[PDB]
């Protein structure tokens, strides 16, 4: 009925280039991957970034923190320091506003 956007769309606009990354949220159940609903997540606790867009998942420490394999780490290693600096500034400004 009315045009509504989602926060994942805006953060996908924030994500630079064509970064591909898979992380998990901190509240991810250990039995979701073994059983059904592996790729159709009930709690949205599996972060999947495909072609620079945030398909699904809830971001947290484990994807945007200072840990190996994070979204920031992959962004650095795939795009460079200039684009990662712009990524940092855009995240902070948009989310703080």
């Amino acid at each position: 009925p009315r045009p509504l956007w989602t926060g994942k769309q805006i953060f996908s606009l924030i994500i630079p280039g064509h970064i591909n990354c898979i992380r998990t949220h901190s509240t991810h159940p250990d039995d979701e991957d073994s059983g059904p609903y592996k790729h159709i997540s009930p709690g949205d606790t599996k972060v999947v970034v495909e072609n620079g867009e945030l398909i699904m998942g809830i971001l947290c420490k484990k994807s945007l923190g200072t840990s190996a394999g994070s979204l920031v780490h992959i962004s650095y290693l795939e795009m460079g320091h200039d684009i990662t600096r712009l990524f940092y500034s855009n995240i902070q400004t948009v989310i703080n506003n």
Binding site: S26, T27, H28, P29, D30, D31, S34, K61, G65, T66, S67
Partner: protein
């Protein structure tokens, strides 16, 4: 001779949790780890290991 079994094992090795059931071999004989105190991002999360099948699953 059976009593000197209990006399000289010692080493205080296992903490004897026996609480978390495994997700791979379904065995509760497990031990937990408490590391990465305070700091900027990482909070204390208990890492539990099952010894028989080697499976590790986060407390979450």
């Amino acid at each position: 001779k059976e009593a000197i079994r209990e006399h000289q094992m010692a080493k205080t090795g296992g903490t004897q949790t026996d609480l978390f059931t495994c997700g791979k071999c379904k065995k509760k004989n497990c031990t937990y780890t408490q590391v990465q105190t305070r700091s900027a991002d990482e909070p204390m999360t208990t890492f539990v290991v099952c010894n028989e099948c080697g499976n590790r699953w986060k407390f979450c």
